[PDB]
C-alpha cells in the first residue's frame, strides 16, 4: 500500500509475532551492511591508537603509579600494563577482523569485550561517540555483516553475497535515528535553545558564509543552535524517507564534516558519515559496483544478486526458526533500551549531580559546558587533627570528578587510601569546587562542609551533598555578559553565587592589586581575615579588597547571594608598561628584558605557525599521526614480547622504549 512504499513494510506485517518476525528477518541486500561494517572497522582500527589510548597506555596504566581511577564498578580494576597492551591488541585484532569480515563473529567479540572493559574501566573517558562505538560493536556482533565484501565469503560459501535479515538494517538505522533524535531532544534544553551552550563556536572560519548574511550573534543562535537542533531532530526522518533522503544526506554530511573540523571528537563524525548511507537502499554499494566506470569490478566485490541465506525468512510456509525470533526480539528490546537509557536517570539518581546521569549515554553532546573557577581539596588528619590542603586532581588522570558525586566519592576514597602514605591518616576530605555551567554564576557543586570520604553516595539515591544548581539565577546571565563587556583588556571579573550559611575564603594574591567585590544580589558580609574586619554589603555595593591577604565572603542572606570579583592583575599591568618602555627603546634603536625576549619569541612563533603553508601543516599532521601509530605499535610489541618471551634486562627495555618514542622523521 502507500505505507508499504513509504515505510518499507505493511501494517499486516505487524499483526502478530509470526508476521513481525517474518518482516524483521526479511531477506535484504548485504551490501550496505558490509560497507558500514568495513567503514566502522577501519575507523575503530584508526581510533584505537588515537582515542582509546594505545599510544598512551604506558603513561596511563603505568605499574606502581599511585593514581585515582574511576571505574563504573569499583571492583573493576585495570590489568598490568603488559596485559592492558594485550587487551588493546585483542581489541585491534577484533576491529581489523570486523573491517575485513574475517572470523566476523569472533572478531566482533574480540573487539567488543576489550572495548567495553576499557570503557567501564574509566568513567572519565566516556563520550557519546565512544558509547556509540560500543553500541555499534554490540549490534554488529549479532548482525550478518560478513555476507558481503568479506574474507568470510572468500573462505567459505553460504556467506558470500548472501541475504541478511532486514532487522540488521532496522537495528542499525534505529540506533542512528535514536542518536539523532535523542540528541535533538536533549538539545531542546533551554541553554541550547537560547544559544548559551556554544556561543563561541560561530567564531570559527567555517561559519564565514553565514556571517555574510547573519551577524555573529545571529549565526550562533540560528545556525549553531537552532540549525543544529533542527538537524538533529529531523535527521533520522530525512534519512529514512526516500523523497527527502538526498537533502537529508547532504545536510547530515555537512553537519558531520563541520563537526569533524570543529571539535576533537575522534572518529564520531566519520562514523556517522559512514552510517548515513545505512538509510539508503541496502544494494547501493552493489549499484556502485555494477556501474563500474573504470571496469574495475573484478577487484570490487560481487555484483550478482545475493544468494539465499538461512538467516532470513523467505515467504512461500517456511515458519521462522529460533534465530529469527531471537533477531526480532533483539531488535525490539534493543531499540526500546536505546530509547529508554538516555531517560533512565530517574532510576540512577546517584549520578545525577547538575546534569542528570553519567556523561556518555544520553546523547547530550555539547549541550552543557562547564567552567570551573577553583577547586580546594581540604583534608583533616584523623589522628593529629591538623588541617591540610591537597593539589586538586593530584592523583587523577582526568578532571571529570569535579562535576560528579560518584567520581568525587571514588576520588575521596582513593585519596583516603593513598594519603596515609603521605603521613595523613584517616583523612576527612572536603571538596570545595566552583563550577559555572553555560556561563552561569560560579557556584559550589558539592557541599564543602561534608566529608565525602564518609559521605553517603548510592547508585540509586539522590546525593544529599550535591548543591542544587541555582537555576533561578539563570536570567542574570545576560547582565553578567554586559558586565564582562564593560571591562577593559586588563580587567577580569568572576561571578560567584554562594549559598546561605556558606562562606568563600579567598586569598587575593599580591599580584592582584586593585581587586574589588561588588554585591549583585542578596547580602554578603566580607571579613578581612587579616584585619578581622566585618563589612556588610548591600545589593550594588562595591568593596575594595586587600591584595596579599585573606578575606571571607559570608552569604548572610536567607537566599543564595550573587557577587562579582573585579580584579586587574596589576603586576601584569606594570609588566606591560615596562614592556612598552622596552619596545619604545628598541624602536629608537634583566628579568624585564627576559620577559620581553620571551614575548618576542612567542610572537615570532605565532606568526610562523600561521605562515606555514597548508601542505606543511597537513604534512606535520601526517607525521604526528604516523608517530602516534608507530609508538602504539612499538610499545604494543614491547609489551607482547614481555608477556610471551619474558621481560628482558632493564637496559634493553630502556633501549626498546626509547626506540618506540623515537620520532619517525
Amino acid at each position: 500500500s502507500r505505507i508499504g512504499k513509504l515505510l518499507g513494510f505493511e501494517w499486516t506485517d505487524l499483526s502478530s509475532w509470526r508476521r513481525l518476525v517474518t518482516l524483521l528477518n526479511r531477506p535484504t541486500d548485504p551490501a550496505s551492511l558490509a560497507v558500514f561494517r568495513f567503514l566502522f572497522g577501519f575507523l575503530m582500527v584508526l581510533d584505537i591508537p588515537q582515542e582509546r589510548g594505545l599510544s598512551s597506555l604506558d603513561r596511563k596504566y603505568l605499574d606502581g603509579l599511585d593514581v585515582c581511577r574511576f571505574p563504573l564498578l569499583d571492583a573493576l580494576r585495570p590489568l598490568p600494563l603488559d596485559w592492558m597492551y594485550l587487551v588493546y591488541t585483542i581489541m585491534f585484532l577484533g576491529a581489523l577482523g570486523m573491517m575485513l569480515g574475517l572470523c566476523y563473529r569472533i572478531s566482533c567479540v574480540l573487539f567488543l569485550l576489550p572495548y567495553w572493559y576499557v570503557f567501564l574501566l574509566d568513567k572519565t573517558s566516556w563520550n557519546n561517540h565512544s558509547y556509540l562505538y560500543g553500541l555499534l560493536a554490540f549490534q554488529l556482533t549479532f548482525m550478518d555483516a560478513n555476507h558481503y565484501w568479506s574474507v568470510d565469503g572468500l573462505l567459505n560459501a553460504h556467506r558470500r553475497n548472501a541475504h541478511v535479515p532486514l532487522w540488521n538494517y532496522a537495528v542499525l538505522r534505529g540506533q542512528i535515528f535514536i542518536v539523532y533524535f535523542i540528541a535533538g531532544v536533549k538539545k531542546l534544553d533551554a541553554d541550547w535553545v537560547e544559544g548559551y551552550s556554544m556561543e563561541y563556536l560561530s567564531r570559527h572560519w567555517l561559519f564565514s558564509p553565514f556571517k555574510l548574511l547573519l551577524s555573529e550573534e545571529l549565526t550562533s543562535l540560528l545556525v549553531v543552535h537552532w540549525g543544529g537542533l533542527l538537524l538533529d531532530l529531523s535527521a533520522g526522518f530525512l534519512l529514512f524517507f526516500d523523497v527527502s533522503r538526498s537533502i537529508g544526506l547532504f545536510f547530515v554530511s555537512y553537519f558531520h564534516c563541520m563537526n569533524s573540523q570543529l571539535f576533537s571528537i575522534g572518529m564520531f563524525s566519520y562514523v556517522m558519515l559512514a552510517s548515513s548511507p545505512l538509510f539508503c537502499s541496502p544494494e547501493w554499494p552493489r549499484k556502485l559496483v555494477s556501474y563500474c566506470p573504470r571496469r574495475l569490478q573484478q577487484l570490487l566485490p560481487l555484483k550478482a544478486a545475493p544468494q539465499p541465506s538461512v538467516s532470513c525468512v523467505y515467504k512461500r510456509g517456511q515458519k521462522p526458526g529460533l534465530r529469527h525470533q531471537l533477531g526480532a526480539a533483539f531488535t525490539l528490546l534493543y531499540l526500546l533500551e536505546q530509547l529508554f537509557l538516555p531517560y533512565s536517570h530517574f532510576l540512577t539518581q546517584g549520578y545525577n549531580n547538575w546534569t542528570n546521569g553519567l556523561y556518555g549515554y544520553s546523547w547530550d553532546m555539547m549541550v552543557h559546558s562547564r567552567s570551573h573557577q577553583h577547586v580546594k581539596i581540604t583534608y583533616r588528619d584523623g589522628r593529629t587533627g591538623e588541617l591540610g590542603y591537597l593539589n586538586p586532581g593530584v592523583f587523577t588522570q582526568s578532571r571529570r570528578w569535579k562535576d560528579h558525586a560518584d567520581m568525587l566519592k571514588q576520588y575521596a576514597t582513593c585519596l583516603s587510601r593513598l594519603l596515609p602514605k603521605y603521613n595523613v591518616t584517616e583523612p576527612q576530605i572536603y571538596f570545595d569546587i566552583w563550577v559555572s555551567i553555560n556561563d552561569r554564576f560560579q557556584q559550589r557543586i558539592f557541599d564543602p562542609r561534608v566529608d565525602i570520604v564518609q559521605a553517603a553516595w548510592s547508585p540509586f539515591q539522590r546525593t544529599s551533598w550535591v548543591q542544587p544548581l541555582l537555576m533561578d539565577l539563570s536570567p542574570w546571565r545576560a547582565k553578567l555578559q554586559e558586565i564582562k563587556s564593560s571591562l577593559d583588556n586588563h580587567t577580569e571579573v568572576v561571578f560567584i553565587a554562594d549559598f546561605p550559611g556558606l562562606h568563600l575564603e579567598n586569598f587575593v594574591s599580591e599580584d592582584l592589586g586593585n581587586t574589588s567585590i561588588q554585591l549583585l544580589q542578596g547580602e554578603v558580609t566580607v571579613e578581612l581575615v587579616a584585619e578581622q574586619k566585618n563589612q556588610t554589603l548591600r545589593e550594588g555595593e562595591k568593596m575594595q579588597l586587600p591584595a596579599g591577604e585573606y578575606h571571607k565572603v559570608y552569604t548572610t542572606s536567607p537566599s543564595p547571594s550573587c557577587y562579582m570579583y573585579v580584579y586587574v592583575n596589576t603586576t601584569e599591568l606594570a609588566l606591560e608598561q615596562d614592556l612598552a618602555y622596552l619596545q619604545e627603546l628598541k624602536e629608537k634603536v634583566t628579568p624585564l628584558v627576559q620577559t620581553f625576549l620571551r614575548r618576542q619569541q612567542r610572537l615570532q612563533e605565532i606568526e610562523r605557525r600561521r605562515n606555514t603553508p597548508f601542505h606543511e601543516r597537513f604534512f606535520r599532521f601526517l607525521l604526528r599521526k604516523l608517530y602516534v601509530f608507530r609508538r602504539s605499535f612499538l610499545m604494543t610489541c614491547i609489551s607482547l614480547r614481555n608477556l610471551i618471551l619474558g621481560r628482558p634486562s632493564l637496559e634493553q627495555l630502556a633501549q626498546e622504549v626509547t626506540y618506540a618514542n623515537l620520532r619517525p622523521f
Binding site: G53, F263, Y359, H368, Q373, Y389, N506, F507
Partner: protein
Amino acid sequence: TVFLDHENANKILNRPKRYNSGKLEEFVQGNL
C-alpha cells in the same frame, strides 16, 4: 606537589590554567 599551602589552595581569583569550556565530549589529547 601532592600538598598545597593555605595561601595557594585558597586562591579563587587565580587564573585557571586555560580557558575552561569543557564539553566532556571532545577527547582530551594525552589525558594520561
